From a paper:
The hexameric ATPase ClpC1 utilizes the energy of ATP binding and hydrolysis to engage, unfold, and translocate substrates into the proteolytic chamber of homo- or hetero-tetradecameric ClpP for degradation. Here, we present cryo-EM structures of the substrate-bound ClpC1:shClpP1P2 from Streptomyces hawaiiensis, and shClpP1P2 in complex with ADEP1, a natural compound produced by S. hawaiiensis and known to cause over-activation and dysregulation of the ClpP proteolytic core chamber.
The main difference between conformation A and B is the various positional arrangement of the seam protomers in the hexamer ClpC1 structure. The P1-LGF loop is likely in an undock position due to loss of the regional density in conformation A. In conformation B, all six of the LGF loops are mounted on the shClpP2 surface, and only one empty shClpP2 pocket is located between the P1 and P2 protomers of ClpC1.
Numbering used by the authors:
A (entry chain G), B (entry chain F), C (entry chain E), D (entry chain D), E (entry chain C), F (entry chain B): 31 to 208
G (entry chain K): 52 to 227
H (entry chain H): 52 to 230
I (entry chain L), J (entry chain N), K (entry chain M): 52 to 228
The structure:
Amino acid sequence: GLGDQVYNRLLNERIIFLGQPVDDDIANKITAQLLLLASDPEKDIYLYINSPGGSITAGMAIYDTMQYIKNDVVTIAMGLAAAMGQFLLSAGTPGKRFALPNAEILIHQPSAGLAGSASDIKIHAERLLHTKKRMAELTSQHTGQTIEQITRDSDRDRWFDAFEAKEYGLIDDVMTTA
Amino acid sequence: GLGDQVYNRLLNERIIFLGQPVDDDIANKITAQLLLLASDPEKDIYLYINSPGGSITAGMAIYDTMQYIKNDVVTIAMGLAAAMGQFLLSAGTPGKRFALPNAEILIHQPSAGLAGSASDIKIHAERLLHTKKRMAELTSQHTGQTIEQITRDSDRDRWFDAFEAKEYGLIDDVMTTA
Amino acid sequence: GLGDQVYNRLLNERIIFLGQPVDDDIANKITAQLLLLASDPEKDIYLYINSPGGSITAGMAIYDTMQYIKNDVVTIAMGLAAAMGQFLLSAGTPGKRFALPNAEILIHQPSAGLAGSASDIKIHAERLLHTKKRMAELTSQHTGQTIEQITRDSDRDRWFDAFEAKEYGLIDDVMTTA
Amino acid sequence: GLGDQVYNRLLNERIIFLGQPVDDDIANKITAQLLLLASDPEKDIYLYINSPGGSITAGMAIYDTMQYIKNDVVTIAMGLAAAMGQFLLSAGTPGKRFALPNAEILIHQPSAGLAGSASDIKIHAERLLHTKKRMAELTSQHTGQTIEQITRDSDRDRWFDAFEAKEYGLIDDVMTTA
Amino acid sequence: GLGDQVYNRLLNERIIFLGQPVDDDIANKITAQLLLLASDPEKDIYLYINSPGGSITAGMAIYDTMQYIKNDVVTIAMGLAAAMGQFLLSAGTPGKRFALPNAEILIHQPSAGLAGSASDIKIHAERLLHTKKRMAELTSQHTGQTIEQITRDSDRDRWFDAFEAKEYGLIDDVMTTA
Amino acid sequence: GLGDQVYNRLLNERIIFLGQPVDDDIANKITAQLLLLASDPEKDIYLYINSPGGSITAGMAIYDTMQYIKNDVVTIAMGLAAAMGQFLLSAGTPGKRFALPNAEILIHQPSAGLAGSASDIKIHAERLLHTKKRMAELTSQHTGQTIEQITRDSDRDRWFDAFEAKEYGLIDDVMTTA
Amino acid sequence: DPYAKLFEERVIFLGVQIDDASANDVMAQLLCLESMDPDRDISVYINSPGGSFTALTAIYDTMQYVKPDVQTVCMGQAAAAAAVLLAAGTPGKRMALPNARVLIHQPYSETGRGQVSDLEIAANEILRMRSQLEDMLAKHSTTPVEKIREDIERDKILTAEDALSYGLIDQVISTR
Amino acid sequence: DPYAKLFEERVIFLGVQIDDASANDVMAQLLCLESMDPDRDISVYINSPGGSFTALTAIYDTMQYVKPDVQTVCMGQAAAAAAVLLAAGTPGKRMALPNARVLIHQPYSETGRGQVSDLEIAANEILRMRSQLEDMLAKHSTTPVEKIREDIERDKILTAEDALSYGLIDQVISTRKMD
Amino acid sequence: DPYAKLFEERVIFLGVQIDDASANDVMAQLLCLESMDPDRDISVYINSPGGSFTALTAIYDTMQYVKPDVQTVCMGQAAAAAAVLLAAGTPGKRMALPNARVLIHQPYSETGRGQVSDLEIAANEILRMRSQLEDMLAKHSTTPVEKIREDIERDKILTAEDALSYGLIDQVISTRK
Amino acid sequence: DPYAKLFEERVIFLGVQIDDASANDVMAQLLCLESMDPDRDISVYINSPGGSFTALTAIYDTMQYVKPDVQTVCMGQAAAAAAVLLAAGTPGKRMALPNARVLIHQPYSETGRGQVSDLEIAANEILRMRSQLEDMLAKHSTTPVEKIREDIERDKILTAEDALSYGLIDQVISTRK
Amino acid sequence: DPYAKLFEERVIFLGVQIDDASANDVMAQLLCLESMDPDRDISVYINSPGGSFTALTAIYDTMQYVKPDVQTVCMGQAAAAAAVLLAAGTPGKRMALPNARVLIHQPYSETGRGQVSDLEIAANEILRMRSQLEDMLAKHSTTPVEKIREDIERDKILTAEDALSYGLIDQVISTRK
């Protein structure tokens, strides 16, 4: 009960949380909170990220909602921002993406599985490749690095601390105090 | 029911509890409570630790949140306060770290597991080594000892009572009565 | 529903309950209740025990919180008070420990388990011996008996009743009627 | 559900239920309700028993609370009073023990189990014998029969309807209408 | 959800449901509701039994409460009234027992199981005989049938619709479109 | 939960849902809602059906409650109405049964296996045949399609969509935009 | 295997729980042993913790049927039905090893859920079984039936000397 | 023991699922039969519901390698890989019982979770496997490969005479007395 | 089959925990070997943890019942009932390997749920079992009874030399050379 | 049974995964075949999907130790360790069936929970194992070691002709005509 | 079967986890081989990943007791207790395959529920066992005991040449020319 009350008070101020793996329910809740907060088209919305990633469609729904409203979204990474946690971390408005000094950021390619007959597997593999290409293209567009560089880097797991992420283009600045 | 009300009334007095093992959920709750209490620029926050440790990244999120806000955080150790509990106890504002007389303290190195192909196992190995080195450096910085001393001591489990912890530098003073 | 209301009203008067095995969450709840009731230093607090024991660290945290505040805590045995239940029962302020006429009191040495490599087994062994020694010393201090007598009686699983506890020193009087 | 409000209004009318087996939770609940209702030292407290029994310690705690609050306790057997249930039903204040006409009562000796080494088995066997003796003596005192009579009548299960219990001494009268 | 509000608003109009097999908890709820509604000695109480019976002791708790509150109890059979449900249906006040036109009624002997040594099995067998005889006697008392007729009819099973039960004497009248 | 508020506000408009398979609990709740709404004697109750059916007795209890009240019950079928679902769908007030255009209706004979001894099996087989005959007679009465035709059709599954149901007699009209 | 050669000697061994399979094996072995030689004795070693009553009755009847004298030796333990089998040997041959025990108690059983009439039939059957066990223990021992009735009410554990004074065995052997 | 007795006159049952152990046993028996006499036919009886693909290819290669002619008889059902094995007999010596059935469909596959590159490699492997199956079926029958591709999209079930007209078998045997 | 040859000469090998089935097998083997020759020496090799007390008593009586002498050899370990079986060999030829260990402690029991009288009877039975085990250990050793009372209160672990000094074994064999 | 008949003709099947028992049986068969005749070839047929690394090591060492030439035939598939075993045959005597496949990839492993030092030791061991495997692959093939290092990063599937061009095998056998 | 032929040639083959049953089988085979011929050598082949310590001590004592020389051959791996068996062979007759590996580390133990006293005796026993293992390694190697104590703190992995330099084996098999 205390957690719900403090979350309500923080949402009242402006704060939103992503402290758990991304799936359908959490994507729906965050989309709901963003749509509700979009009623004021002036003040900026803060979004804290601490999650190991999750599903692709749900996170891309969150990203579309982030890019759809006129408000500015300030993403703050704390503790961990891995897989699509990084992806939503880098999706913030330019100049307003931050990480805490002891935060780690991970990048790697998507993963899935296959089952069915030969033709169904063929179709699913084609669309998996398409989704991977779209992920790489969006990462290159947001970070600033070239598409080929991002493709070379995100072939296995890669880790970054705050300053490597800052120089790499994943985040805009490192936030230490207020 | 009753526990939630008691916790709320205690939160009204700027008191935060850190029982149970630390994970993503309790880390998010503690971070939310700290951010909500940080609305007062100049006051104090009391934190009680009775945890046997847990996730490294959640503890890091809590630690960065503690360092981020301007308010002084007073940590009081009761019960076990081991592993990441010890780290969060030692990370309080200098001169404002305390432990009850019959309180244990334990220090040891982190633990994890390995799985995957050779390349992924390798990469995870460097990441684990870097995390361990960072933990040692932060412990040495906060406790006032040398990095080599901390590395040599924290190879196996090491136990302290209140006074040994005070002498070692983990805490500042042992509280007996208000 | 009704239980929450009844416990709320009892806590409202002055009263605290420990009618279950001692572990982390109940220890945090009791510590929170003690701290909350410690706002008024003049009045005293009544506590009831019906418990078969529990973990050492949670009981020691409760004991430390009991001693920390300047309020008087009156412990009343309310059925079975064994292991840590006995330890917390005798930890009340002198002259304010009571048991109902039909109450069972038990004392015995702590029990635990061992697992790991030889060095870890060793270290855990010294820690277990040290905590057993501390428990014996504290029991001897609170009950007025000699440490050797406490060790002799607590090696095995000696039982008691109200009057044997009164003459032994575990309690101060047998409470009947108001 | 609706049961919570129904029980709340019944408590407002000074009515207590025990329609479930006796354990630590329900014993704490009954003791809490008795202590709360003991604020008025004039009015009576009605308690209905419908249970197949439970743990000895919890029932003895309830019995002690009944004998301690110096308020009259009117016990009503309401369908089944077995083992500890019949003990609590006979534990009521004299002249205020009743049973419904179609109510079943029974008496038998306690049961338990033994595990451990030879010394532990020895001690627990002695304690089981002692508590059986105390149960027999208390039943003899409350019913008015002879200790040997109760001992011989409780070697095996013995059943009772309302009138046989009334003539035996388990209850004092049988309510029919008012 | 909605069940609580609808049941409370119906209880405000003195309507009670028994739409589930009878056991300890529902028996306690029914008894509590009957006692609460017994505040007004003039108005009557409606019962809406449709259940496949349950335990004997809970059924007799409810039945004894029905014959004790001095208020007229109107019972209505809606779905399936079998075993103890039939008993509670026919236990209502004479001239105020009804069944909907498409209801089913079942009568049969009690069932149970035996386990233990020879002496305990013997005692429980005698008790089962006694309770079966009491069931038959009470059924023959409430209905206009002889004890021999009832004990012959309830050997295995017997089903009734509304009119057959009316002619037999289980109910008083078939209520439709009222 | 949003379901609670929406269901409350819909019941304030005299609208009832039957969206899950029929059993004891939903039958009890729907009967409670019908009786509660029957306080007003000149308005009508709209009942929406989307269910694959359920137990015979619960459905017959709902049917009897529908027929008992003087209020006319307008039934609307959306999704599907199979087995007891269509039986309650056709049980509405004549001239006031409707189905949405993309709705399916299924009819088939009852099915409920039973086992035991030879005599019990014989008795239960007779009961099953009697219930099947009653089902056939009631649906023939409500659709006006004779008994032999219904018996021939109900040997196996038969499906209808809007217009086939209208011409067959299961419903009265196919609703479009109001 | 040692069991085959012990059988060739003329020794039946009963160190397993008493069920239908073990009783069938014992009866077949007894019949074969009687068939091969109807004059020499048959030795039965008992180390079983009791079992079912019907198998007990079958083995007891087979033992009483055969012409050769059956010498029963108790080693380890003989509980419940095994006590009856040990005491059911021909008089003068029942014997037990020094620190062994014989445990006797009334039968224990349970039945599935059913109507009251079936439970009554089962209870009558179990009472008949206990009475039959009582008679079997009474005729093959020394103590009167009333003392046995009062005695098997609870578990009764007898040492070798206690059994010898009871009459279940005849003489305690230390070494052959 | 009947099975050894039929093995004496060079008869092999394949009546279980096609997996590694079954394939190994079959090829061991085939090699022994070839070694015993290299110029007498070997009879293979098929009553299997299908199986893995590697075992299928191994058995097919062993059948093609041995010098003596292999006569395949379909008895109950011959599904998936069993259909290919039945069609892989010596031409003119492939038989089916009157009420037997033959089921043909494209390979089925399932893979565990992994990165996208591994999934792409696995999908390419599966497509190669399907192409190999199509070629194997086209080689040993009188149907154009395009019709094979169209047919094996879903489960194609053929009776005895449908298989005979389809080209998988050469003869349908009714009774011994009628020759 | 090596075990076949070992039993063929004189050797009974006991390497599994002591329960009813293993005790029955050991008893049958002992009786068979006694039937072969009532004057030779049977050898029993103990490499097992403890077990049920009834099987222990059965095997003890079986060894004490036949004429042929029983030579107990401890190897690996012999704990609880296995220690008593080791000490139950004929005097002068009870031996152990150099690195073997012997563990002794009082019996551990677990009874099912039951009434108080049943538990009292079971407790009396357990106590007399412990006393009987005490007497068996005292009879076959050079240590007085009270010292055994003190020792078997908790787990007692003895090396080969410690066991020899205790009196449980007569010789510690090093090598055949 | 056919298997004994093929064993009499110096033929060994390897049709299950490579574990301790399979490796033990294979090496025992190899030693017995060598002792029976020390100058006749031994045939090994491979239809395995992989297995443990240590068993692969033991089998490979036993193959390299025996005096007679060893001829390896890949029939259905040879994945991971089986590919190394297939390539480890006597040069010029390595064969595969036409519709056969050979799969090569870097080793996979998983470790239980433990402290960081243990994990570092395990990672060093795994890297050493991969280096040994790629050295074995480079020694018995006509491919530069860096090419193998680049190729075995992910799963690599080779047909019979692809394996022949890679140097793993020597001939592809179609029919006996 | 090949195992029977190997046993006829005085080869005891150990490729299974070291437990009570495997230790008993090895001990019985050793006794049988010693009885059949007390002069020829006995070969023990090690492919086991370790096991309990009691079986280790039993096997080591038996293999030291017999008069014939025992030749230990490591292959695949020899971890923990198995390593001791590799180093416990008669000097100059301990050998390993080129690619075999050896694991050495301190014993791992686990104790269930218990009072503090019982855990104290258990910990003392575990420490005694670890010291005994250290002494056993020191006796049969060419390394001072302090170095072994420091080495076995964590898992130590030795290749064939590393084992040869360490003193656990005397030579490394290469091939049969």
